[PDB]
Specification:
It is classed as immune system. Three copies of one chain form a homotrimer. With 115 residues, chain A is mainly β. Chain A has strands at residues 3-6, 13-16, 22-26, 29-32, 36-44, 58-62, 65-69, 76-77, 80-84, 89-94, 106-113. Chain A has a single domain (1-115), classed as Jelly Rolls. The two termini of chain A are 15 Å apart. Bound molecules: magnesium ion.
């Protein structure tokens, strides 16, 4: 049962696994250590009162954005399923940290299977 | 597996814990965990009512999925974190908006660390 | 683990609960909840007559339809399938995709007994 989750604030990385399918590298960024099928989950809650000159863009990145969010008027789900390979780096990136509400913004991942 | 599925008509609740059926289309989550939702929503071509087409999967009273295109047969497959005490329900602006024989939803626990 | 994966080219099938029938097409032999995953990449120099359209079909029913030709698209999802069901990834024209970066896979997650 290999599962990891970053957020929401004030929480950082939580993790449970055997000995393990991933490695946490830094905030919002992990490293896949086992080829297999994974599920991503989580929530991006945009900041309504963002007062910055940068365009709202949240991306989930595989090394390649595999999920791009450009609508700052909607709370967005990150739930999905992907095949990843050992070595891959998974990262949730924000064009500015102030674009999202970090107290209601998290993402996680779980190994579903390894063919 | 901890699994529950409602519909399609004439089937009601089927179950194989982590949840408790509350009524038609509505469930109570009993454990914090990671869940997969699956299912399909088929608009009813015979609908002539005056309420706009809308179907929503609500966690508690908040929509986590919203369907407004009455010309789409939409899949409900997704992954979510739910907590104990959450209710999950599929709601319709009108029962006559969907073909009940072709509309169902299910949920399975993936893990609950 | 009951898995099958077609592609990407030149790979075809990599691999009971299912039977592979043809390129991009398989026969579900067992009831269950299945996860689909994969990727569809449009061919940016397609100039055929058919409108772009790629579909995951269960029997006669497109469970997923893609009509956006400007972006690579992910196929990840969970569906309930039944013994007998066929599953195929079909293209309105094979020129519409770059087979070198188009593939799909499936795996049985559970087969609950209600
Ligand atoms: Mg061949």
């Amino acid at each position: 049962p290999c599962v990891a989750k970053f957020g929401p604030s004030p929480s950082e990385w939580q993790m449970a696994s055997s000995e393990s399918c991933l490695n946490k590298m830094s905030d919002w960024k992990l490293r896949i250590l086992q080829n297999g099928l994974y599920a991503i989950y989580g929530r991006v809650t945009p900041n309504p009162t963002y007062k910055g000159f940068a365009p709202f863009e949240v991306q989930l990145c595989k090394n390649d954005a595999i999920q791009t969010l450009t609508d700052s008027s909607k709370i967005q789900n990150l739930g999905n399923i992907y095949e990843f390979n050992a070595g891959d780096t998974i990262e949730l990136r924000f064009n500015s940290d102030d674009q999202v509400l970090k107290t209601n913004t998290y993402f996680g991942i779980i190994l579903l299977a390894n063919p």
